[PDB]
Design a protein around this ligand. Structure first.
Ligand SMILES: CCCCCCCCCCCCCCCCCC(=O)OC[C@H](COP(=O)([O-])OCC(O)COP(=O)([O-])OC[C@@H](COC(=O)CCCCCCCCCCCCCCCCC)OC(=O)CCCCCCCCCCCCCCCCC)OC(=O)CCCCCCCCCCCCCCCCC
Ligand SMILES: CCCCCCCCCCCCCCCCCC(=O)OC[C@H](COP(=O)([O-])OCC(O)COP(=O)([O-])OC[C@@H](COC(=O)CCCCCCCCCCCCCCCCC)OC(=O)CCCCCCCCCCCCCCCCC)OC(=O)CCCCCCCCCCCCCCCCC
Ligand SMILES: CCCCCCCCCCCCCCCCCC(=O)OC[C@H](COP(=O)([O-])OCC(O)COP(=O)([O-])OC[C@@H](COC(=O)CCCCCCCCCCCCCCCCC)OC(=O)CCCCCCCCCCCCCCCCC)OC(=O)CCCCCCCCCCCCCCCCC
Ligand SMILES: CCCCCCCCCCCCCCCCCC(=O)OC[C@H](COP(=O)([O-])OCC[N+](C)(C)C)OC(=O)CCCCCCCCCCCCCCCCC
Ligand SMILES: CCCCCCCCCCCCCCCCCC(=O)OC[C@H](COP(=O)([O-])OCC[N+](C)(C)C)OC(=O)CCCCCCCCCCCCCCCCC
Ligand SMILES: CCCCCCCCCCCCCCCCCC(=O)OC[C@H](COP(=O)([O-])OCC[N+](C)(C)C)OC(=O)CCCCCCCCCCCCCCCCC
Ligand SMILES: COC1=C(OC)C(=O)C(C/C=C(\C)CC/C=C(\C)CC/C=C(\C)CC/C=C(\C)CC/C=C(\C)CC/C=C(\C)CC/C=C(\C)CCC=C(C)C)=C(C)C1=O
Ligand SMILES: CCCCCCCC/C=C\CCCCCCCC(=O)OC[C@H](COP(=O)(O)OCCN)OC(=O)CCCCCCC/C=C\CCCCCCCC
Ligand SMILES: CCCCCCCC/C=C\CCCCCCCC(=O)O[C@H](COC(=O)CCCCCCC/C=C/CCCCCCCC)COP(=O)(O)OCCN
Ligand code: SF4
Ligand code: F3S
Ligand SMILES: [K+]
Lengths: 117, 172, 82, 164, 106, 158, 87, 69
């Protein structure tokens, strides 16, 4: 099961860095070593992509509070939420009673940047 | 019945020529860089080192394990099989042998070694109770840890050393 | 069947017969050519996909947060569910 | 070759020597090794020839180039012959049927001994043509003949050295 | 050759291309580029897609927060009711359902 | 007891506001034809027949009525769904023929191993391409919801 | 051919069936459950004692003339109403 | 209930690592990930011939003959 040994294991950072470097300096003269250069290069390319993502969300954090729902301990609760919604029809049988008319208020704000009245 | 997936010469007599050819390929004879100096007696080997060969030097080459390996059923002419791989590691493990890297480089081939899928039909049917699967697993681990970029050149240089050999299977 | 008996085998690198090994090499190029082409799908999806509730989202930023700086008072129960 | 890259003789020697041992050390018997690697060898071989052109008379680079070219010649020749043997073996296998039962057995090869005679003749030609590559020839073509010898009983000079 | 000659001649030109006509460098580069795609590019793309998903959904959710703040309303269900199925919780979707109900019933 | 199936509210509005018949474009016809049958153990999803009715009705482009605007938005969403179905067949055919030609000289086992997976992968690629080219990846959640509203609903008394 | 119950072919099939069928059925059931969860929220079946009374009520509420509406009984427990004048 | 700011970097980054790690693991670490390479080597490799008839060649050949090339 698997290919013949082509290089170092993943956790060997110094060994992988050597193959990743050769991807640019020493051209490969066989498929096996070229594949190894890509796999070793993949380690750092993937690490860089994840690295920037973590940096980006720290330097420029997400502004909404929705992401508090993605906490690990809240995941099972979110799963149960989608399986426990009230049965019925998507269409409204009776008008909804809200204390604020959001569509009407929204229209006024866009037109004037000012609340009605 | 004769051994599975073998060409029957007559009745129960199988045709095991391929098995013999594969065995000769690994060159199962001690190799040393320096010839025995005059006045030198047997090579030193401690009891502990000699104990490593206990489970591997007892093979009778019956080929029961060879013909019980499904990987050998599919690729008999490319896969060395449980018996030949067990013997290859016997010489690799031997302390007296000084060509460990050459042997590991040659055996480090996708067809020769890595067709073993851990089925374990080899250890189950061994008449002498040897464990070819265990030895094959150790050889893979040793090769993976010891691999170097220069192994391919090592194989080539040994092939040049075999240039004047007669016909037959060999290191190449 | 009867395989041809007058095959002119390859003699050197510059006098080569066409064999299945060469045809396999052509397969390798074509299958890898497919991998280059099929990469357009995942890239196209990421570049073109959008996730927006409705057309009001753009209108809200245009009128209430044009510089992506306007802070908004947070009321946790809104998006917290309870 | 169309390239603007420049290399010193020391670099050219290293590239040619690396390619020479890469080809010779590779296991030619496994067909996939040649399928996957040959495209890489050709690209490199084109570069090596271009940079080593001024050193074809060099006392060090010269011999390496000759061996490299000779090895590539032998690799293609052995591959072609062994490729034909694989076809003969595959035809024999399919003639066995499904599960080797003959359930949907195909038509057998009616001129198997003729093919064996043709293949062995090619095998002998390789040995004479490439006296310094016998280890590789025996690995690919010599072993292939031994497999065929199981299917059909034919005589070749090295048959006794393969336990036949 | 008549009309047939033209038919065969056009086909001969049409089916001219073969991989064997490629230069040695381009033959290998195509394999290299294909191998690079499978190993490197493919696993990276989902990560980039995840990044854009988060950024766009954050943009969408925050717009709802901005709207509520300007309205200065504590009636959360009026802006996004979490009990309604599918996407109908969003206030815009609720309005569309309200329009449908009004125009359908008497 | 008994279950009563009646047209949904949005279906009622479409019937009330339609002005004429709408011509079915060529890709729309092929898309509907290639759409799989949908058995209905229960009723919650639009099938090829419901989609045909939606595409057949014609609405006034200039009407400013909010209800009519919803009908147009629903129709556009359904149209994108229907034409996207054309991508499935080309992918499946290419998913089978191309690997089969590639493995033509190989044994039957290889074709059994490889073709089923390539066939499914080809169809998947076709469906992605069809949905992508049908502008489905840029629809807002509002438009998608309207295009997925059921046409038939169990009647709820009172 | 020589077939034996303890053969690798037959034993592998039984091992595969025992190992995978319990997993597959559970996995398929879970997906079916998720589909049911969405289905009931979008359109829950509701039972009416008398079809005629419900049908009349439906026409009144929606302002539909019964003459132009066609009523058909797809099954014993299913009755469907359709527009008579539909393209 | 009305915080002046909300900390999202920690939660978002944790999700990124968990999602990225799982995907990168499945695609990079396991040996099972090379299962398709093994199956092809076991049953498909070197099992080919040009002297046996196959439908794709026959179909192409007949169509060319039918159309006179
Ligand atoms: C195309 C190559 C492209 C290569 C790459 C580009 C580089 C090349 C650049 C230069 C190109 C030159 C163009 C040549 C035109 C054809 C003539 C020719 O060379 O014939 C050689 C040879 C004639 O020899 P000659 O050297 O011309 O001179 C002979 C002597 O002079 C002795 O004279 P003679 O009296 O014995 O000769 C009798 C003479 C009598 O001819 C004359 O009277 C002389 C003038 C002929 C001009 C021909 C121009 C093209 C006609 C078609 C026009 C279509 C208009 C469409 C308008 C749009 C709306 C529909 O016959 C001809 O000249 C042969 C005419 C062949 C016409 C067919 C062209 C190919 C098929 C496409 C058109 C199909 C039309 C179907 C109509 C059906 C009606 C029911 O013709 C043949 O034997 C074979 C004919 C078939 C040619 C097939 C070409 C390949 C087509 C597929 C290309 C695909 C490319 C790949 C990518 C495509 C991506 C989509
Ligand atoms: C109106 C109707 C009529 C007109 C129609 C339109 C006409 C337009 C004309 C102008 C445009 C032309 C377009 C290009 C077409 C050119 C095709 C071509 O040249 O083919 C060369 C090719 C030969 O070249 P070769 O390299 O030597 O190949 C050898 C064989 O092909 C052996 O091959 P293999 O065994 O290695 O297998 C091949 C297969 C190996 O692979 C496979 O088999 C596996 C495939 C993957 C597995 C999964 C399958 C899933 C498939 C999914 C499909 C897509 C789904 C998504 C889309 C859905 C739809 C929306 O390769 C592939 O599948 C690779 C595909 C690569 C795709 C690359 C796409 C490029 C995209 C470029 C970017 C986009 C455009 C630019 C804009 C960019 C903007 C950013 O010919 C063939 O393939 C023919 C094979 C069948 C033989 C019969 C036909 C030929 C005649 C032979 C006669 C022999 C007679 C001998 C007689 C001897 C005695 C006298
Ligand atoms: C459901 C829809 C999808 C279904 C499948 C669709 C199939 C079409 C896919 C099209 C994409 C491209 C396909 C490969 C292109 C060719 C690559 C190539 O030539 O590279 C050298 C290639 C090895 O390339 P490599 O990239 O160095 O090695 C890949 C390693 O895995 C080392 O990889 P790594 O270290 O870079 O790690 C990354 C690894 C990461 O891999 C993964 O992510 C895992 C995938 C594992 C495989 C899953 C499927 C297993 C199916 C086994 C086969 C079926 C058995 C029978 C069952 C049914 C019985 C009735 O990536 C891969 O394994 C390759 C990905 C692309 C191909 C495989 C796609 C699998 C899709 C699976 C989707 C479902 C996933 C569910 C997960 C559930 C989780 C609990 O070696 C060979 O070609 C050996 C051939 C031996 C036989 C001789 C054949 C003639 C030789 C002449 C040349 C022919 C070329 C074409 C070969 C294929 C002919 C059929
Ligand atoms: C030798 C081999 C080297 C190993 C490989 C190294 C490659 C690593 C590459 C990582 C790429 C990161 C891409 C992130 C994609 C996700 C984010 C996204 O798309 O958002 C769009 C974002 C912008 O969106 P945004 O959402 O972040 O924007 C918010 C910012 N404001 C508020 C201002 C709008 O842009 C980018 O993606 C920019 C990515 C920059 C990545 C830089 C990577 C440098 C890596 C250095 C490695 C050095 C190697 C040296 C080797 C030497 C060898 C001897
Ligand atoms: C030296 C090491 C070299 C390693 C090379 C590794 C290459 C890895 C390739 C991965 C490709 C992933 C593509 C995902 C699809 C993205 C499509 C897209 O929408 O893109 C545009 C968008 C633009 O974002 P946007 O915000 O404008 O919105 C576009 C529209 N939406 C929002 C709908 C998506 O995002 C990106 O640009 C995505 C990130 C691209 C990162 C690609 C890899 C960067 C590799 C950097 C190497 C650094 C080298 C270090 C040394 C330098 C020395 C000088
Ligand atoms: C240096 C230290 C670094 C440490 C890094 C640690 C990394 C690992 C951390 C784990 C992160 C996990 C993030 C999951 C994504 C966030 C959760 C999410 O989106 O759910 C909320 C979402 C939000 O739903 P929502 O839209 O209802 O949220 C609103 C919530 N209410 C209604 C209450 C207002 O939930 C859902 O959509 C429901 C389905 C959830 C699916 C969860 C997927 C789990 C993935 C498991 C993978 C396991 C792989 C390994 C398995 C091995 C088995 C042997
Ligand atoms: C060819 O030999 C073989 C190898 O080479 C030695 C292998 O390497 C290998 C290993 C290869 C692999 C593991 C690769 C993967 C292999 C797989 C998935 C299996 C491939 C083989 C097959 C699918 C078998 C081919 C198909 C069949 C044998 C058909 C099976 C179905 C059968 C026999 C049912 C047909 C029965 C009938 C037609 C009878 C009909 C009955 C009636 C009409 C009775 C009517 C009665 C009344 C009352 C009216 C194998 C399996 C092999 O068989
Ligand atoms: C022996 C025991 C056996 C047990 C068997 C049963 C086990 C059951 C286990 C629990 C299963 C629970 C499944 C729950 C599924 C719920 C799915 C869900 O809620 O999804 C929708 C839900 C929101 O949708 P709705 O609220 O319906 O409204 C529409 C949009 N506003 O989705 C989300 O909130 C997002 C979910 C998190 C996604 C995380 C992954 C990131 C996905 C995007 C990746 C980036 C884009 C793709 C890039 C690809 C590039 C190639
Ligand atoms: C190799 C075998 C090929 C076999 C044929 C395959 C054909 C595949 C076609 C069906 C699948 C396509 C995807 C499914 C459809 C998606 C939805 C759709 O219709 O997409 C369009 C957009 O998508 C497309 O346009 C897709 C086009 C795909 C074809 C692209 C190539 C075009 C050039 C063809 C040249 C043909 C040359 C013929 C030569 C003849 C010589 C005699 C949506 O836009 P609309 O709002 O409807 O209107 C757009 C314009 N107002
Ligand atoms: S069965 Fe045991 S003794 Fe016989 S060849 Fe195999 S390992 Fe050696
Ligand atoms: S049965 Fe075969 S697969 Fe390995 S464990 Fe034994 S040699
Ligand atoms: K030793």
């Amino acid at each position: 099961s698997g290919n013949a040994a082509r290089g170092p294991p993943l956790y060997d950072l110094p060994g992988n860095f050597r193959y990743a470097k050769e991807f640019f300096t020493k051209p490969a003269i066989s498929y096996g070593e070229f594949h190894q250069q890509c796999t070793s290069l993949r380690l750092f390319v993937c690490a860089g992509t994840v690295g920037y993502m973590l940096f980006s969300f720290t330097m420029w954090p997400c502004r909404s509070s929705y992401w508090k729902n993605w906490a690990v301990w809240k995941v099972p609760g979110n799963i149960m939420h989608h399986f426990s919604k009230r049965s019925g029809s998507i269409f409204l049988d009776e008008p909804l009673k809200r204390t604020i008319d959001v569509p009407k208020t929204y229209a006024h704000l866009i037109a004037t940047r000012r609340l009605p009245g | 019945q004769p051994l599975p997936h073998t060409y029957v010469l007559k009745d129960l007599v199988p045709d095991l020529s391929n098995f013999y050819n594969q065995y000769k390929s690994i060159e199962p004879f001690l190799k040393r860089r320096r010839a025995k100096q005059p006045g030198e007696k047997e090579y030193y080997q401690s009891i502990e080192d000699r104990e490593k060969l206990d489970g591997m030097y007892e093979c009778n080459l019956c080929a029961c394990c060879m013909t019980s390996c499904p990987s050998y059923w599919w690729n008999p002419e490319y896969y060395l099989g449980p018996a030949v791989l067990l013997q290859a590691y016997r010489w690799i493990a031997d302390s007296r042998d000084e060509f460990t890297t050459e042997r590991m480089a040659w055996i480090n081939d996708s067809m020769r070694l890595y067709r073993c899928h851990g089925i374990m039909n080899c250890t189950s049917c061994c008449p002498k109770g040897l464990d070819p699967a265990k030895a094959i697993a150790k050889m893979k681990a040793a090769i993976a840890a010891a691999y170097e970029p220069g192994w391919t050149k090592i194989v080539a240089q040994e092939s040049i050393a075999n240039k004047k050999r007669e016909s037959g299977m060999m290191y190449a | 069947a009867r395989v041809p008996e007058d095959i002119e085998f390859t003699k050197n690198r510059y006098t080569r017969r066409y064999n299945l090994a060469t045809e396999d090499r052509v397969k390798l190029l074509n299958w890898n050519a497919f991998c280059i082409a099929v990469t357009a799908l995942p890239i196209a999806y990421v570049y073109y996909s959008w996730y927006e509730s409705s057309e009001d989202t753009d209108m809200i930023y245009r009128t209430m947060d044009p510089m992506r700086e306007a802070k908004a008072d947070y009321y946790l129960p809104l998006l917290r569910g309870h | 070759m169309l390239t603007v890259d420049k290399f010193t003789r020391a670099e050219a020697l290293q590239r040619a020597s690396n390619l020479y041992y890469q080809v010779l050390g590779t296991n030619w018997e496994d067909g996939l090794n040649l399928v996957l690697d040959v495209p890489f060898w050709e690209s490199e071989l084109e570069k090596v020839d271009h940079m080593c052109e001024p050193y074809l008379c060099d006392d060090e680079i010269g011999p390496i180039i000759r061996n490299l070219h000779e090895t590539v010649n032998c690799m293609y020749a052995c591959e072609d012959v062994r490729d034909h043997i694989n076809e003969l073996l595959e035809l024999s296998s399919r003639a066995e049927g499904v599960m080797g039962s003959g359930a949907a057995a195909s038509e057998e090869v009616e001129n198997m001994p003729e093919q064996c005679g043709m293949v062995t003749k090619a095998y002998e030609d390789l040995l004479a043509r490439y006296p310094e590559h016998h280890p590789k020839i025996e690995q690919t073509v010599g072993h292939g003949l031994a497999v065929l010898r199981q299917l059909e009983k034919f005589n070749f000079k090295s048959s006794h050295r393969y336990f036949f | 050759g008549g009309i047939g000659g033209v038919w065969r001649g056009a086909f001969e030109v049409a089916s001219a291309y073969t991989a064997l006509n490629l230069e040695r460098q381009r033959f290998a580069n195509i394999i290299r580029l294909g191998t690079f795609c499978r190993v490197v590019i493919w696993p990276v793309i989902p990560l980039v897609g995840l990044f854009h998903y988060i950024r766009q959904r954050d943009r969408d959710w925050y717009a709802l927060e901005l709207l509520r703040s300007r309205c200065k309303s504590e009636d959360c269900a009026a802006f996004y009711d979490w009990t309604m199925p599918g996407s109908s919780g969003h206030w815009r979707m609720q309005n569309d359902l309200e329009i449908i109900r009004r125009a359908a019933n008497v | 007891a008994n279950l009563l199936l009646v047209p949904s509210d949005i279906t009622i509005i479409e019937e009330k506001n339609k002005i004429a018949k709408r011509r079915i474009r060529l890709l729309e016809k092929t898309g509907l034809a290639l759409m799989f049958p949908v058995f209905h153990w229960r009723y919650s999803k639009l099938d090829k027949h419901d989609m045909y009715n939606i595409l057949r009705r014609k609405f006034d482009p200039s009407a400013s009525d909010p209800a009519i605007d919803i009908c147009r938005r629903r129709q556009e969403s359904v149209r994108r769904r229907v034409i996207a179905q054309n991508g499935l067949l080309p992918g499946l055919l290419l998913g089978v023929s191309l690997p089969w030609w590639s493995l033509r000289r190989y044994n039957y086992q290889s074709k059994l191993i490889v073709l089923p997976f390539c066939a499914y992968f080809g169809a998947i690629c076709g469906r992605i391409a069809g949905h992508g080219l049908s502008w489905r990846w840029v629809e807002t959640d509002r438009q998608r919801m309207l295009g997925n509203l059921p046409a038939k609903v169990y009647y709820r008394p009172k | 051919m020589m077939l034996r119950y303890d053969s690798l072919l037959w034993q592998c099939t039984l091992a595969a069936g025992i190992w995978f069928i319990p997993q597959d059925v559970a996995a398929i059931s879970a997906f079916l459950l998720y589909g049911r969860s969405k289905s009931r929220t979008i359109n829950q079946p509701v039972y009416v004692d008398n079809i005629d009374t419900a049908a009349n009520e439906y026409f009144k509420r929606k302002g539909l003339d019964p003459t132009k509406m066609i009523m058909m009984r797809k099954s014993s427990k299913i009755t469907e109403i359709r527009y008579g004048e539909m393209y | 209930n009305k915080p002046v700011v909300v900390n999202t970097s920690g939660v978002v980054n944790t999700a990124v690592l968990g999602i990225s790690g799982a995907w990168l693991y499945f695609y990079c670490v396991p040996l099972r990930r090379k299962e398709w390479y093994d199956i092809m080597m076991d049953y498909v490799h070197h099992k080919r011939t040009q002297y046996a008839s196959n439908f794709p060649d026959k179909a192409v050949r007949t169509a060319l003959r039918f159309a006179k090339v």
